[PDB]
Amino acid sequence: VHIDLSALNPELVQAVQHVVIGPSSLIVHFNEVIGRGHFGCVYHGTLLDNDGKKIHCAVKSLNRITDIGEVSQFLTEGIIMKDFSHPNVLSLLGICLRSEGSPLVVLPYMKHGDLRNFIRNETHNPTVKDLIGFGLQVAKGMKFLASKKFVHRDLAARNCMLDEKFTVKVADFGLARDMYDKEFDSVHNKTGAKLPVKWMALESLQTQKFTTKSDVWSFGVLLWELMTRGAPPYPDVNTFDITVYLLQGRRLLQPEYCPDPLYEVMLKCWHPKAEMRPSFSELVSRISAIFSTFIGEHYVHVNATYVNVKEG
Ligand SMILES: Nc1ncnc2c1ncn2[C@@H]1O[C@H](COP(=O)(O)OP(=O)(O)OP(=O)(O)O)[C@@H](O)[C@H]1O
Ligand SMILES: [Cl-]
Ligand SMILES: [Mg+2]
Numbered sequence: 001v002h003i004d005l006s007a008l009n010p011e012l013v014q015a016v017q018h019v020v021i022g023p024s025s026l027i028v029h030f031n032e033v034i035g036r037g038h039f040g041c042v043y044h045g046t047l048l049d050n051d052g053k054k055i056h057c058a059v060k061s062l063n064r065i066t067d068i069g070e071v072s073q074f075l076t077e078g079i080i081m082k083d084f085s086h087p088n089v090l091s092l093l094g095i096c097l098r099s100e101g102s103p104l105v106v107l108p109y110m111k112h113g114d115l116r117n118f119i120r121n122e123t124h125n126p127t128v129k130d131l132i133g134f135g136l137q138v139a140k141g142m143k144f145l146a147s148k149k150f151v152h153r154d155l156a157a158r159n160c161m162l163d164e165k166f167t168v169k170v171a172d173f174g175l176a177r178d179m180y181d182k183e184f185d186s187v188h189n190k191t192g193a194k195l196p197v198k199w200m201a202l203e204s205l206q207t208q209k210f211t212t213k214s215d216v217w218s219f220g221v222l223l224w225e226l227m228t229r230g231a232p233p234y235p236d237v238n239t240f241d242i243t244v245y246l247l248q249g250r251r252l253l254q255p256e257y258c259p260d261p262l263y264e265v266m267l268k269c270w271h272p273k274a275e276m277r278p279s280f281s282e283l284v285s286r287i288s289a290i291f292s293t294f295i296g297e298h299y300v301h302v303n304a305t306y307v308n309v310k311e312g
Helices: 010-015 068-082 115-120 128-147 177-184 202-207 212-227 242-247 260-269 280-292
Strands: 026-036 040-048 054-062 094-096 104-108 160-162 168-170
Touching (some): 010 068, 026 054, 068 094, 115 160, 115 212, 128 160, 128 212, 128 280, 202 242, 212 280, 260 280
Antiparallel strands (some): 094 104, 160 168
16 A cells, blocks of 8 residues: 555645654554454554653554545544544544555553453353443443534444443444445445444445434444343344345344343334434433443343343
8 A cells, every 4th residue: 555645635734733643653563463353453552642651552554545535534534533532432542644554543552452342251240230331331422423423334342442440432433434435336245244234224234324323223233232242243144135134124132131121222223214213312311211220230141152032
């Protein structure tokens, strides 16, 4: 990937200067891979603060941003994202604008990793309260993004991170855009198996457009992930034909430990009409009420070999 930085709009280059982190401020430990996902690779990094204090960070390469036009748009979004501050939204510390690679985002290192692994771990023992509480934190972070008219596009439990205080931080907002654009219009992905279709709203699968209302659908799937302690949604449905599955009149089953009013909320998030789905503001209100009724005595028991659903 070669990016001709002299081909960027001068006013943009000036406008994003305060977001850009230079090589003398950042070491990316490329031999210390954290992992790879849908649209990038994450590495350990070391950032210097204003006082020259050493800061542990995570650095993500955005590998599907490969062309000047895509870099340009990303920079505009970087300026917007840098200004976000909310306890349930992962900070953007800055960006690396490279001439010989895809651009990087510099993120605070999240001590306790992602929410999906945190709940899946068999040595952890979450209660219904704990799981709903995590969902409330995610709803709050999404309520903030929605207030900024900022579409996530890749919301899922894997993209909610936990910091040293166990505060949930919604992560990877906006960054899936170019990967989606390319994979929707690729002769190598006509099946759609390269995309996270299990979290996508019906209308997003059909139209390739993403909105805050489509994030609400993803949030419903995220709640299902929470209440099953990280089960994979819809096993053996990983293609655009999830649309066929959905249109037969189907939704994810109620997890055994999912309270009835929370399952009602999930069904609202998957309303066929996007405009009839609750806002994140409404979701925070409703989930705060359901959360308040629990006292942390109902341990959620799951097993690796199957998903336990409501039966009695
Ligand atoms: N700020 C961070 N601190 C620590 N680990 C991180 C951070 N950001 C991402 N990771 C981890 O790096 C790995 C890869 O992240 P990446 O975001 O590319 O994939 P993902 O989150 O699994 O899926 P997606 O591509 O849908 O985001 C994951 O293990 C992820 O939890
Ligand atoms: Cl409980
Ligand atoms: Mg991610």
